[PDB]
Design a protein around this ligand. Structure first.
Ligand SMILES: *Cc1c(COP(=O)(O)O)cnc(C)c1O
Ligand SMILES: *Cc1c(COP(=O)(O)O)cnc(C)c1O
Lengths: 393, 390
């Protein structure tokens, strides 16, 4: 309706204040430059382990492109793949202990997998009831209508395991579509309950891991796999590989490494995994190098640095999430106009913090979405806390 | 389906599906055993996937920026490289252009909002899909159906489309510019006549038309239309002939930012899905420079001569087209798989299309002509293919 006038004004206002839609150059040190030349620390980068600045990863991307001398990793888009692609998927498979396919985005992964899960081909031919968590990322939830073409679709309230329990008792086959780590709300998927229902009813678990992989778990295998240990044949993960894994694209984690069936079924479906371009060679080079990194001691070190930085920030600034180990923080200011001016003020003083405003969030619930990363120094956070408290005076 | 999957297994077992080959210069593939073959099914129509200018620009962009992401750790900001790439494509097509990580993502970000009427003055149009619209759009009908009426008409049936225009206040027609199966083209003269008469909104997937067709390679629709109007939208893939990576929305005229802002502010992949990395954007910039230089008409001349050469030596569905796509119908899926297996051993990969890719009993090899084929390449192929009749 006419809230569209309201939302457009916020977008228009964000752009006018320079807190949205600016052209900034990536500066070493989690920093952003500007045409004027001013530098700002990026307090909202999604590269949670700072791997976007890894010389190791960038040089493997350059090497892969230079030694294959082709961008595309298909052979001119025919149904054949470069050795580089098989190596990258083998590398992701070793890391995750699972059969893994790459795609050009996590969103493509969801498009390739959800309508298949809905049809029944992944669950012994029984079309499951597709149960969507209300807070599931839009790359999944915007596809309910394709799922509806295949089966009954339900949406439950956030983490309502009891309603899920009911649906399981009422139907032969059920699937649960959710995020591992929700970026707003600070919540997590209820893994203990979900695994109990999967044990009791054979519930299919489908997790979007984009904010989980790298930041959580041994070797950054992520929230689900850390608790789970070895994936089973009733659990599927999609994830993005350019938020902290430090490369490009997304990925499907089909299930166990020694079972080709789910990959075969999904590869032979009509979806992006069949007819949408594979990752280019620099991206695949970067995934291989990051996979090695994730298996090295580099990874627990970066995770120690990250939790160190979370503790620092939480000790100096109060924000929703304070005390979590998910490096996402919400500085709620309520007023869309205040959030915007706070964002503009902080940028002028060396710190970019992205403003969330309606439609992105509820009306009267606007605020600054900060993200903690390994590549923040102790100076960066302490000086940010100093500028943030000076604004409150 | 089990038969189709049974066909998939043989294809893989024969080594004509799902094998691992290395790219070899000259449009070639090297197997593990050193067997080198000519790829007769590559989609790099102008040979630009072997352009050393483009490949170096890709390397250069990655080394100057020292990051992969073209966002700033995915905040709602962009590297100068991304703006330069979208301005390069804006100069080339004479239109407001956004990049995306794929043409599929371009369809996902645009078709729901077009269905909603946000792009047609608040009036939800009737969404009419050509029968042969590519899957990346056709598989999104249900999302369109949540916003308005969806219709699928017979392929290129401009009369059924005209009946719809007369019976509804606003209609949008979703189709391909160039169809890869059937060799057909979008009836541009009819479609534009309906648009001038009814305000029909035209949505073109230009994936097989970018670079191949048109002065400077602006594609089929823009070469005839000249300048894009406010009722015409394009989506295209940039890794098929353009020689780069990703895909792009062609919103409309360069001077109107309203469709871009509406799309960007909508809940879709253009907002929430990662932008192209820096080597791809560098490639896009360099290839755009190439598409405005004299190298593009030269490569197109080379392509048409290869099509003519092929058409004279080999009888194939499409023969006579100016579209570099040909189908060697063999009917039997097994004959198609054996013929593919045979040609690859004698130096030529042609991909086999079997059920479910195509109908039962309409299996065949799908050849594509590119600028990077030599005369010798095509002459030798026609011989090995004619010898197979023996
Ligand atoms: C290649 C193709 C697509 C998909 O392109 P991607 O960029 O790989 O997602 C869409 N439409 C047509 C006609 C295509 O040929
Ligand atoms: C990052 C994000 C996505 C989108 O990932 P892309 O790789 O850009 O398609 C999907 N789900 C969640 C939870 C995300 O955070």
């Amino acid at each position: 309706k006419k809230l569209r006038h309201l939302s457009d004004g916020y977008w228009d206002s964000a752009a006018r204040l320079g807190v949205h839609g600016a052209v900034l150059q990536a500066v070493p040190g989690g920093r952003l430059s500007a045409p004027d030349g001013r530098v700002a620390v990026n307090m909202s980068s999604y590269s949670y382990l700072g791997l976007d600045e890894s010389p190791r990863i960038i040089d493997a991307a350059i090497a892969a492109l230079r030694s294959n001398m082709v961008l595309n990793s298909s052979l001119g888009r025919v149904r054949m793949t470069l050795p580089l692609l098989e190596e990258a998927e083998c590398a992701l498979g070793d890391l995750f202990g699972a059969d893994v396919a790459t795609l050009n985005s996590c969103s493509a992964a969801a498009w390739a997998t959800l309508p298949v899960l809905a049809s029944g081909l992944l669950t012994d031919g029984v079309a499951p009831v597709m149960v969507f968590d209300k807070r599931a990322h839009f790359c999944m939830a915007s596809l309910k209508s394709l799922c509806a073409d295949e089966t009954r679709v339900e949406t439950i309230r956030h983490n309502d395991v009891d309603a899920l329990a009911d649906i399981c008792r009422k139907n032969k086959r059920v699937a649960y579509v959710c995020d591992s780590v929700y970026s707003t709300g600070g919540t997590l998927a209820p893994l203990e309950e979900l695994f109990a229902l999967q044990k009791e009813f054979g519930l299919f678990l489908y997790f979007d891991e984009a904010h989980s992989t790298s930041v959580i778990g041994d070797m950054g295998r992520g929230y689900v796999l850390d608790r789970m240990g070895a994936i089973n044949d009733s659990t599927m993960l999609i994830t993005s590989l350019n938020k902290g894994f430090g490369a490009s694209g997304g990925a499907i984690v089909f299930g166990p490494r020694d079972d080709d069936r789910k990959r075969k079924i999904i590869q032979r479906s009509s979806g992006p995994l069949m007819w949408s371009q594979r990752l280019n060679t620099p991206a695949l080079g970067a995934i291989i190098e990051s996979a090695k990194l994730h298996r090295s001691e580099a990874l627990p070190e970066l995770q120690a640095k990250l939790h160190s930085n979370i503790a620092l920030f939480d000790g100096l600034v109060r924000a929703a999430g304070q005390g979590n180990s998910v490096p996402i923080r919400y500085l709620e200011l309520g007023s869309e106009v205040d959030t915007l001016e706070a964002s503009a003020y902080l940028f002028d003083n060396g710190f970019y913090v992205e403003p969330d405003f309606f439609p992105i969030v509820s009306r009267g619930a606007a605020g600054l979405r900060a993200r903690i990363r390994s590549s923040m120094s102790t100076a960066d956070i302490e000086q940010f806390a100093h500028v943030w408290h000076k604004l409150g005076v």
